Amino acid sequence: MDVRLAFPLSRAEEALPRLQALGLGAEVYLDPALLEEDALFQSLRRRFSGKLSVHLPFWNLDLLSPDPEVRGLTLRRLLFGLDRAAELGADRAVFHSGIPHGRTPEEALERALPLAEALGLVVRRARTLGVRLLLENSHEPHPEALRPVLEAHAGELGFCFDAAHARVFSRTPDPGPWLALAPEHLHLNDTDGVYDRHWNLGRGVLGHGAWLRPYLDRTMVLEVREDPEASLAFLQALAG
């Protein structure tokens, strides 16, 4: 299996030895504060040869923000993030739609085509760089909010499914309707069904055994804020 550990670039020194020991790939979150730090990117690129993807900046970003300076900053963050992704030899780059929490499904649907358009520049930059861009569900109420964005880009934009986000932030806690969007990339952890806990698999309420098995040949990112070995064991148990 292609199992990866999520970690911020700021904690790469802690992460690296654990990746090697467990045979894990990496998904490196690109701390905005570190985007200009050339040495850190070169250091990471030369030292690690496992499968690598990035998480692009997301905190307080939205291409569709009512604040035009936020819109500008968001575009710069995503584009520079992709430049760093290409530099690191990343296969995939994951990002958020920027939808605020608490939109109704109807409001979310109204964001779809404007988002599809705003993402053009970003999808095209990813294309030029040879990085696969993946939209992760965050605060979208339902998969119908994302389907038109994916369809509009005709296969150029992939989908990353985060079941905890659906459970805790959306109007669609059931993984099924999201899985119908055909995620090629999965963000894995467990939750108590209240907070985005980032627990190891097997510890919360998501019941991955009932839905994850068909997707074990796809890239799985452990988004866990504790030692990931328990989750890797869980996955190996499911794999046979």
Ligand SMILES: [Zn+2]
């Ligand atoms: Zn994310």
Ligand SMILES: [Zn+2]
């Ligand atoms: Zn996630």
Ligand SMILES: [Zn+2]
């Ligand atoms: Zn998360």
